[PDB]
């Protein structure tokens, strides 16, 4: 008895094949008699409609580009006291002795983060990195520091 009252007051039969629009439009080759209705809708909606940008594609250049090719060369200048502070900080971070809290690979890491943060590594940074990696027996990492110095 509680199901005999709740009829189909919510749904409707689906669109047949080659059906027309409720406004009278139809998908023909000639769309002169058909019209758009984007200008009758309200201009701004609080939220997102179910048909809002449902089929929206982007350019092929976004999916054919290589890595790190969008980064432009920016000359980030700073104060010379900031230069001294950051150079001393990176030189102390490179020269950390490898205990149980530091692996020697960090001596190669803090050089690389020096170049990602757009600093020019001085010769003392390369000297300290090669001496720290030679003191731990990592000779290929020291040659990689030399290759980093040559590629700069």
């Amino acid at each position: 008895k509680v199901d005999s009252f709740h009829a189909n007051t919510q749904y409707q039969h689906a669109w047949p094949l080659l059906s027309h629009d409720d406004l009278g439009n139809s998908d023909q080759s000639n769309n002169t008699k058909n019209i758009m209705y984007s200008m009758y809708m309200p201009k701004r909606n609080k939220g997102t409609a179910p048909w809002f940008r449902g089929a929206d594609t982007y350019s092929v250049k976004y999916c054919e580009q290589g890595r790190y090719e969008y980064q432009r060369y920016l000359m980030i200048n700073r104060f010379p006291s900031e230069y001294k502070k950051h150079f001393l900080s990176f030189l102390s971070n490179i020269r950390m002795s490898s205990g149980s809290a530091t692996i020697p690979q960090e001596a190669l890491h803090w050089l690389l983060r020096m170049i990602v943060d757009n600093f020019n590594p001085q010769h003392v940074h390369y000297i300290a990195a090669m001496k720290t990696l030679q003191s731990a027996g990592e000779l290929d990492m020291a040659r990689d520091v030399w290759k980093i110095m040559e590629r700069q």
Binding site: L23, G24, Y40
Partner: peptide, 27 residues
């Protein structure tokens, strides 16, 4: 007010809906 926003597309003369309205208001 009483009119909807689709009123000018619905009652535009020459349209399918306007011809249907004129045909049902005068058979």
């Amino acid at each position: 007010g009483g009119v909807p926003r689709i009123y000018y597309a619905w009652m535009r003369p020459g349209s399918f809906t306007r011809r249907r309205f004129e045909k049902m208001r005068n058979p």
